[PDB]
Design a protein around this ligand. Structure first.
Ligand code: BFQ
Ligand code: BFQ
Ligand code: ZN
Ligand code: ZN
Ligand code: ZN
Ligand code: ZN
Ligand code: ZN
Ligand code: ZN
Lengths: 342, 342
């Protein structure tokens, strides 16, 4: 709701993001072709998603900053930082799609799968990352929270990349990796690869912009936000297999990629030795029939109903955490986020 | 000389770099496997080079900072920042080797070509980049030049990535791209992809650490250092084809990769229409015989003698620039660098 009534404005501001990321270099004609390639990268890879992470910066900013301090310049900085979180996401997704050998993203073919792009996409991804710090300098250099924001984005990237490392290490291609797929391992992976940048980062950014920099307030916010992030990634795992492709915008690869997904972890906890064997001989391979066998096993073990029940229990757990840890922040900050993902 | 007598110490300090980049996370057991993977990444990809860029930080620091201010802690910060430049290099090289489809680097098989690594190397590369800002925070957070260093590394990365973008855009695979290969295009590519991070960055870092932050002193240093960087990349292009593989540590790919190298640019300037045609039908392709035909054409046009002459003329030009622009810095700062690359 509050996201919906910030959204269209948020998106309209992308043109200014792209203009400033192109004009700040108009003094250097020789890099014109690169700046043009950057524009094409931005428009293909930063547009077409739900923009939830960026909108969260904007929404939380409005709720944390006194209305009389919400001048036009402060608002502009708010939705610039929001777009920075979107650019970080864009960076991650371009690189992750190569590494997961994915086909489609946000309803179109993955950037790297586009003819003429290929592994040049690696440099495109790093360029998207670079844009973050260009925008922070351009818009936030003279603000008291400047360094707090730089370090938050840098730290969030490190954490996410540690998470990606765990994701990859736990899913070696061509191996049978079932004994590695535990609940304890899973919770660690998603905490790092998803939870910090998708939930802590956006709220923390708005917090620092509102002058809320205390270690205690950030630790309490984090308690709520990392648990939301854990649920969100479990949801991502569920939809990878059981989601509507016209809604998700992308084709799942978790089974073919031998991933430690919530689904396989739950499967393992429930499987008979006979089902375990079936899982063992069909998981982590590219053959459609082997993947289909896995999905059949998940359905036989009623993992969809297990998920639906987990979703409700998680929601209740998250709301309990908000009762405990939200103060002194407006509870609406976390409630609006929860409403978005549940 | 001054590099040689700083070197072994510089290298010995790598163990402390690796220890601190592993222990700063010992409070988080769950990411142990990732930290182990990080260690393996560091040891494979940050070791085995000449360390010229890192040593330059250390050497320039000793020459710019008054001896009485060179305490043990300041020295330690100096060779930490030196290793940061080495980590940036490591980041770039891992990614560049994937994008150039290279086989060997520093005398061993490229990281991504190592069995079991593959495109996971993309995340490894970004992890190396992340380590830079972890070390700066760990060692330099309370220093007055902290933000200057963060912004210098971030800006240098952006510039290098713009350069990489130009490098890639000018070398589309499967196309004949000769008309794109001009001197003007070439100078732009190497200014951005090589010159800023390999020469300006290390000296600028030492400068900020010495308290030299004036725009004018940095602009004058840059005048010398970007020209050195241009020569250095021309040298890199020459050695890609004409260097001794047991000395370079790597196999060239510029011709197969259809690159705008100094060599092809010089070839084009000198070729008859008949030689142009030969270049056109053999450049940018993977067949050994076609590559060999190109190298034969270069040798027929005596590009090796052209290079040797250019190297001498460039040296003289660089020394002239040092006479003009070195003050108020010790000329030895730039002379030691020049001696390293010429
Ligand atoms: C490069 C860092 C990637 C961080 C991974 N994120 C969770 C987003 C990518 C995914 O969620 P996605 O389902 O591919 O969108 P994955 O399930 O592969 O983790
Ligand atoms: C990812 C950014 C790469 C920057 C490129 N640098 C010049 C180092 C790589 C090279 O010098 P290298 O010869 O492969 O070591 P390239 O000739 O491909 O440019
Ligand atoms: Zn993915
Ligand atoms: Zn992934
Ligand atoms: Zn997923
Ligand atoms: Zn290369
Ligand atoms: Zn290259
Ligand atoms: Zn080269």
């Amino acid at each position: 709701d509050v996201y919906a009534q910030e959204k269209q404005d948020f998106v309209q501001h992308f043109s200014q993001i792209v203009r400033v990321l192109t004009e700040d270099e108009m003094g250097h004609p020789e890099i014109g072709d690169a700046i043009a390639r950057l524009k094409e990268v931005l428009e293909y890879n930063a547009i077409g998603g739900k923009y939830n992470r960026g909108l969260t910066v904007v929404v939380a900013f409005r709720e944390l900053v006194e209305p009389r301090k919400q001048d036009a310049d402060s608002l502009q900085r708010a939705w610039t930082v929001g777009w920075c979180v979107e650019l970080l996401q864009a960076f991650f997704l371009v690189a992750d799609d190569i590494m997961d050998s994915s086909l489609t993203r946000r309803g179109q073919i993955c950037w790297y799968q586009k003819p003429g792009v290929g592994l040049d996409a690696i440099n495109d991804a790093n360029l998207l990352e670079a844009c973050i710090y260009r925008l922070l300098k351009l818009y936030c250099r003279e603000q008291p929270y400047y360094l707090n924001l730089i370090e938050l984005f840098l730290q969030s990237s490190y954490q996410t990349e540690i998470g990606q490392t765990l994701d990859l290490l736990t899913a070696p291609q061509g191996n049978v990796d079932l004994v590695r797929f535990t609940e304890k391992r899973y919770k660690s992976i998603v905490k790092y690869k998803t939870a910090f940048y998708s939930f802590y980062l956006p709220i923390a950014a708005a917090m620092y912009m509102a002058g809320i920099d205390g270690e205690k307030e950030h630790a309490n916010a984090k308690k709520i936000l990392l648990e939301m992030g854990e649920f969100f990634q479990i949801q991502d795992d569920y939809l990878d297999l059981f989601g509507d492709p016209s809604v998700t915008g992308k084709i799942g690869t978790d089974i073919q990629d031998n991933k430690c997904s919530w689904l396989v972890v739950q499967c393992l906890q429930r499987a008979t030795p006979e089902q375990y064997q079936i899982l063992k001989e069909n998981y982590g391979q590219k053959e459609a029939e082997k993947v289909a066998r896995v999905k059949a096993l998940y359905e036989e073990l009623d993992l969809p109903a297990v998920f639906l029940q987990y979703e409700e229990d998680s929601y209740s757990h998250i709301m309990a955490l908000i009762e405990q840890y939200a103060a002194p922040l407006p509870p609406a900050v976390f409630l609006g986020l929860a409403r978005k993902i549940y």
